């Protein structure tokens, strides 16, 4: 969509990841794994929570009745009231229809945006030690064991530590 990651260059989501909203899968010499990224997940949730708060805040406006349920209303004044209520109703179902539509749009795209921002964050961490798959993956041009994978997710990967080994593997030399 707006940011190209969700329903974009990421072919599909992970039903397996009941751990969070965004996360990592890997594959090295010791095998595979998965781990949710907490910060990106909480950043999205909080924006949702924020919307659900503005939605749920209430006006202090008290309305008394201008229509007797049990007795007749004078016919002319009754028509004016009917005309006025329906007009107000129409205004409110429009606003409600609009709000939900606009907010859903923004919600969908900000989730895409936070996914893209995790992706960009990791890309810049690895800088010259990896390359993009085109499908949200990074091929890593050095031995990256489980501790190393963790250091990537845990945002502590030091690229200079593996740069030499990586640049050679990328250039395909020794």
């Amino acid at each position: 969509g707006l940011f190209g990651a969700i329903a974009g260059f990421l072919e599909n989501g992970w039903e397996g990841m009941v751990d969070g909203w965004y996360g990592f899968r890997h594959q090295n010499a010791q095998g595979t794994g998965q781990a949710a990224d907490y910060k990106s997940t909480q950043a999205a949730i909080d924006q949702i929570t924020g919307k659900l708060n503005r939605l749920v805040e209430k006006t202090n406006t008290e309305f008394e009745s201008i229509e007797s349920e049990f007795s007749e209303i004078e016919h002319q004044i009754g028509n004016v009231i009917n005309w006025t209520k329906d007009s107000i109703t129409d205004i409110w179902t429009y606003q409600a229809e609009l709000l939900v539509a606009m907010e859903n749009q923004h919600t969908i795209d900000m989730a895409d945006s936070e996914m893209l921002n995790l992706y960009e964050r990791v890309r810049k961490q690895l800088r010259q030690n990896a390359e993009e798959d085109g499908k949200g993956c990074f091929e890593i041009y050095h031995a990256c064991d489980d501790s190393c994978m963790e250091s990537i997710r845990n945002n502590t990967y030091d690229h200079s530590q593996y740069r030499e080994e990586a640049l050679l593997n990328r250039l395909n030399i020794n």
């Binding site: 909080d46 924006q47 949702i48 924020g50 919307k51 708060n53 503005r54 900000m110």
Partner: peptide, 8 residues
């Protein structure tokens, strides 16, 4: 301080 859609 201002209000946004997501942050009061």
């Amino acid at each position: 301080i201002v209000k946004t859609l997501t942050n009061e």
